[PDB]
């Protein structure tokens, strides 16, 4: 549950039309949008939603935690159903999934009970996401027709629907399941390797790339992530190619570039692929495939939005648009685009991908870029970092050192990104530095910065202002 | 213990004036000034120090943790000392009260082992710093000639150095001190009153306003605060104005305009004013008495500056200038007087009041402008709160309720202050209202804010955004 009123974006109807308003897909960006739609203009417009999955508004983010036991059970993992979507107005088709679109016509053709469904529309909201990428590996093939991502092997599994985590969750149940191999060492298969390991598994983490999390913390931190992995058991296979996953009827071994592992479960947790073949080539797409869109999530055709996973986002750290698979995202660009569809002018203001990740009691955040991936991306960047105590060392308990990274541009002094680390919840913290880079603060303004002083939460002389204050690039 | 080396804001000497500084004072505005002057720029510079206190670098914010007992002495309330300082490269002169300044001749006489000593400067700062605030009551004076605030009627006390908690400590010993009367309930009274009940006495906090923190947090916080206070036994009484401490020799009773109170000690905790004496009426001075500076923290006497609680600042909540006496504005002040003392040309930036506070495990952060103070400063202001867990539901443990409060500017759209209470730390929060403040940020802009979302730290409509998003005016 986490509902509420009108938004401070919605304003007089005046004088706009009524549109009648499309929306294709209803997770995480879908439902945002449309109850940001139905509870600030309600009435005013005709909202029908098209969803090809059986169930909606799941929270992804949870399965590593259910998975891992580190919640009771899978009930509070939905924060909408079909029903309240309806009590607020809208018409929902589920497991409908909407095979093609007529700009022209303006109506999508969705195959509703076995049979193809015209729904005609003024607005067209794309919330369609993304899917699980396979990368090559022998042994590793999708059942033909699975919108579920279902492979043809036995114990080999893809992480992305609940139905997944509810399949891997269930064959975790026979005792045959005593290795698992997980693939991709983000943050997800990171979540995942602990929560096998919860479950009492032998645990290998494989991946091609030479550490954890990269991309997202610098090495100092990627290491100790991986530090911690490796005392709970996790084995760490890093730099090494899969080549292929073997076995007579199920999973059996996983095969390498450099080794061999006995595994009775291999997890892919490679990355996703935006869902936005529905453009038709009609809608301009970014690189990867995401539809291009602007501050207002509209695409390159008028009265057709996009957000979500599906779309693009304008990224403040690099300055340039972007693509940020993040349920944050989802929902603020789902908000941006609700009003914008209802005809009210609201321009989005861009993320910084903020992050976080708690794995075995270290905890971590991080918000625009690394000083790796900055000047991987041809920026003149440097880091300020320090590791200090968070109170006064005569505090008698609850105190705890924290790592802190603000990687700032040497050239134009602005702030583009930072780090935080440690074995207490600091995260609150990241929010300052998402809206530092947001706003352009620069280091040496940080550093002046008023952060409160008092013996009980922090030092007077605070890892902030010391790391911003030691600036020395 | 909080050194450092140069500053981001230090530069090449190039083809400047080296110059004798004085530096009237050594607390926290003292000590972050002469320390910024000898690590940044040592050599080229010539500092001479005089403070009329025996003890320098106190950290009285540590008082209340001292006197309640919750950490060991005064063991860590020193962050320097006049060996420190001098190996730095400073002149200090201890027990040396500054008792005139000749402008003209540029020249300050001090009393030195009871003889003058003349010092000449070519430029002079000021961090006198504050005194208590004692209003007219009968009983209640400080003995004439005292520099440490000794009241002349035993037991009446004030805490603001190192010898007034010792004193109250000192006074504490004898059982005969049952009863004890705390006459002020900002942050400090409210902090005693604490101490006093921690120390097993009967603690009634007395102030003239309706309700504690005044000015600090809105009514909704200050009940909560209040009630927080009661529910360890301090007994309330707001809306009184103490007349009268009497007593045959020493404390007995204080009598206010609604009631009389038996009590064997009273301590007078009102606040902070600005000790400027030595201004001679020469310099400017504020509408408190002030030392009223610009954003450079140099009077209106060129070549003089003013540092910490016995000068002004700029208030980016009201944006305006503004008396904030905080040892975090002590530090900031005291390095930007530093460095334009040493013709480094650094412009302040403001600051916003962040300030926190932690009774009972009852935890709140404030920043700004609460909305009763907006509203009394003739903004035509708002508030938006909200109350919600901190995580998910399906969080086992560790979850907590957060109230926050955000308040704006009706008409500007500026984010005006914030507050935040809860039973867990949730402090760290409060740094990006602050900045928010300081960046002008609108309350429509803050509303998409980039917050990250993982499960175990927060919800995906977390409390921050869902304030913003009920933005009502
Ligand atoms: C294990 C895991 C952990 C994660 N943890 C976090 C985290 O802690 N914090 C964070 O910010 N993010 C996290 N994410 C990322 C986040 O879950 C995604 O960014 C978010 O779910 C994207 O939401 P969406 O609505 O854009 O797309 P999706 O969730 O991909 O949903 C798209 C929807 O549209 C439907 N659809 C697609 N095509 C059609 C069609 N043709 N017709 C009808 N319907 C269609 C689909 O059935 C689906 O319901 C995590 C992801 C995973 C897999
Ligand atoms: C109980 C208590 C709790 C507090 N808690 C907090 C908190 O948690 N967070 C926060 O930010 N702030 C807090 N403060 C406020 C903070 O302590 C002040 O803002 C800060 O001390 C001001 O520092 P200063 O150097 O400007 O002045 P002061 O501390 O007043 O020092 C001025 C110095 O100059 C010397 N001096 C004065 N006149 C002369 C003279 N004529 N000749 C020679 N020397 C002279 C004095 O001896 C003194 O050492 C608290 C204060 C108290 C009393």
């Given at each position: 549950g986490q509902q509420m009123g009108r938004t401070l974006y919605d304003d007089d109807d005046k004088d706009r039309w009524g549109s009648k308003i499309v929306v294709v897909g209803a997770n995480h960006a879908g439902t945002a949008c449309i109850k940001t739609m139905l509870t600030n203009y309600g009435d005013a417009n005709e909202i029908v939603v098209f969803d090809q999955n059986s169930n909606i508004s799941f929270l992804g983010c949870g399965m590593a935690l259910w998975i891992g036991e580190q919640?009771?059970?899978?009930?509070?993992?939905?924060?909408?159903d079909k029903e309240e979507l309806e009590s607020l107005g809208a018409k929902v088709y589920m497991?409908?999934?909407?095979?093609?679109?007529?700009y022209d016509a303006k109506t999508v053709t969705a195959l509703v009970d076995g049979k193809n469904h015209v729904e005609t529309y003024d607005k067209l909201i794309f919330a369609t996401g993304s899917q699980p990428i396979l990368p090559p590996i022998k042994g590793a093939e999708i059942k033909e027709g699975s919108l579920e991502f279902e492979?043809?092997?036995?114990?080999l599994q893809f992480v992305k629907l609940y139905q997944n985590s509810a399949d891997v969750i269930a064959k975790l149940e026979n005792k045959d399941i005593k290795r698992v191999a997980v693939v991709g060492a983000g943050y997800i298969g990171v979540e995942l390797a602990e929560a096998f390991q919860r479950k009492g598994k032998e645990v290998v983490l494989i991946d091609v790339?030479?550490?954890?999390?990269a991309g997202y913390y610098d090495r100092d931190l990627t290491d100790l992530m991986a530090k911690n992995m490796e005392e709970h058991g996790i084995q760490l296979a890093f730099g090494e190619t899969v080549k292929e996953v073997a076995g007579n009827?199920?999973?059996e071994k996983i095969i390498t570039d450099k080794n061999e592992y006995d595994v009775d479960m291999v997890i892919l947790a490679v990355g996703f692929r935006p869902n936005t073949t529905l453009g038709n080539g009609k809608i301009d797409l970014f690189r990867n495939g995401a539809f291009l869109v602007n501050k207002r999530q509209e695409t390159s055709i008028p009265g057709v939005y996009a957000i979500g996973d599906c779309a693009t986002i304008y990224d403040n750290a690099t300055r340039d648009t972007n693509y940020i698979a993040l349920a944050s995202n989802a929902v603020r660009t789902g908000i941006v685009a609700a009003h914008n569809a209802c005809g009210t002018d609201l321009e989005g203001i861009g993320v910084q991908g903020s992050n976080g990740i708690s794995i075995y009691g270290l905890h971590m955040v991080s918000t625009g870029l690394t000083l790796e991936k900055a000047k991987r991306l041809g920026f003149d960047a440097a880091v300020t970092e320090y590791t200090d105590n968070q109170k006064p060392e005569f505090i008698e308990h609850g105190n705890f050192p924290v790592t802190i990274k603000i990687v700032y541009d040497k050239d134009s002094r602005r702030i583009l990104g930072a780090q935080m680390a440690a074995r207490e919840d600091v995260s609150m913290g990241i929010h300052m530095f998402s809206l530092a880079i947001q706003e352009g603060v620069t280091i040496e303004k940080l550093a002046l910065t008023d952060i409160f002083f008092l013996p009980h939460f922090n030092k007077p002389y605070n890892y902030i202002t010391m790391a911003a204050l030691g600036a020395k690039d």
């Open positions: 919640i009771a059970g899978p009930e509070g993992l939905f924060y909408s497991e409908s999934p909407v095979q093609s679109i007529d492979a043809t092997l036995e114990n790339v030479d550490t954890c999390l009827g199920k999973v």
